[PDB]
Amino acid sequence: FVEPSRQFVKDSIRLVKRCTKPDRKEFQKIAMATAIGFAIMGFIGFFVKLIHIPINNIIVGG
Amino acid sequence: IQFKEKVLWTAITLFIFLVCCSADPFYWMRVILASNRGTLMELGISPIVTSGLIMQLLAGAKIIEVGDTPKDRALFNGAQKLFGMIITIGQSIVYVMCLLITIQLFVAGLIVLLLDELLQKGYGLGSGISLFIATNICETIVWKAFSPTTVNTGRGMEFEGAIIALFHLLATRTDKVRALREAFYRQNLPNLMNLIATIFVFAVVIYFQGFRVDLPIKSARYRGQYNTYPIKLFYTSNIPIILQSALVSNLYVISQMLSARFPVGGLCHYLSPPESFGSVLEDPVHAVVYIVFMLGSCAFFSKTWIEVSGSSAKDVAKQLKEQQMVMRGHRETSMVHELNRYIPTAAAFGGLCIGALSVLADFLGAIGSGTGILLAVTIIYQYFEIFVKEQS
Amino acid sequence: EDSPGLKVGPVPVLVMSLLFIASVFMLHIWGKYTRS
């Protein structure tokens, strides 16, 4: 046997109980904010194709 | 200065990046990029991130160290610029051995290098490299759930393969029966269904980002004041956990054909099956040993990084001692004895979740990360609040 | 050279735009903006 494994497993999941932990309204406010940020980062892929594709080559059938 | 200014410096960089996008190439390189060089992309992130992490490994190492001077800062920046060209020349010459992109690449490494330094100074967090990572990841999740112009997996029965899209199938599918069930015609990976699962795993990581500890903390000479220290549960910024999982798979698989000069199927298979093969897998024992090996690897990169380039015992001790912090019931020194425990256990149990992002690929639609887009969303929480405070 | 500590101002913005426009248009062979 190896001592440390068993103790690292203790000292890791009781130190999540020293953390302040999410409250209901505060889980909502981060959780709302996430969904916005990634719809902005969405838009990059769609628009820039129409300037790219007919300049790069004409064989595309569109 | 102004929060109105501070957004302008972000628009500049935003729109510019928006138009823009061993002995073999690396896996992780594909992750951060999302075009693998287009016709205007001209490796827009690659050099900056390769240069910053080679240099951080050199810098953190005890042999040379950043002092408090202007001068070590200057040379570290200079050092990163010089590496960044080197890596792009090193790469690019190989694909040549054609007239158009070689000439263009040199003009495009002149844009990027000062630009990246326009958002570490002109904006607070993020970085130029962060903003780009976040956009490139968010890109490839959304394009396959709307209309891919290549092929739309999960549902088929068309062998056009060139206009098969999610919206395009939605029109033809109403003239027959549902395929929006748990039944699909060929079920390789239904792409509407893969997004529903994507946003689930995001939810459990942000829950643990709210987990962090703050301490109130007094000072030595005068006891009558109290300050604060925030201890963030996560460590190594999660970059050499995600990167180091990948770059050790490269150094086995490249070598196999290199050993031959001095076998794609069997050698790979028996050492590591890649990723999950579903909730039913494909291996009753080969997949198990791989997963257990993976989490061990990822847990171990964190415990080795902190001492030699990361923050641990000494790097935190140096910080407090400047302003002569002391504990209410104790002293300086013996905070250090309690973060000897915390830093390794928090760090590496942090890691065992950046690992359990990477194996998922059928409940996650991200191209490898995890880490890099999520550091971006945490940085939004910080700046979003700042904007609510000033507005109110 | 590398003597500048600060890297924000009007002037860097003009330099990034000026280059970005040659990259987009001048060197392309597809739209016949230079001939060989």
Author numbering:
A (entry chain G): 7 to 68
B (entry chain A): 26 to 46, 58 to 133, 148 to 312, 337 to 466
C (entry chain B): 61 to 96
Sentences from the paper on this structure:
On the basis of these structures, a detailed model for protein translocation through a central pore and protein membrane insertion via a lateral gate, formed by two adjacent transmembrane helices (TMHs) of Sec61α, has been proposed.
For structure determination of the ribosome-bound translocon in its native membrane environment, we applied CET and subtomogram analysis to rER vesicles isolated from canine pancreas. Notably, the density accounts for only one copy of Sec61 in addition to TRAP and OST and also extensive classification of subtomograms focused on the ribosome-bound translocon does not yield densities that might account for oligomeric states of Sec61. Fourier shell cross-resolution with a cryo-EM single particle reconstruction of the human 80S ribosome18 indicates that the resolutions of the subtomogram averages derived from either idle (12,500 subtomograms) or translocating (5,100 subtomograms) ribosome-Sec61 complexes are 9.4 and 10.0 Å, respectively. The initial model, resulting from the two described rigid body fits and the adjustment of TMH10 served as an initial model for molecular dynamics flexible fitting (MDFF). Compared with the starting model, the C-terminal domain of Sec61α and consequently the interaction with the ribosome remain largely unaltered with the exception of TMH10, which moves 13 Å towards the ribosome.
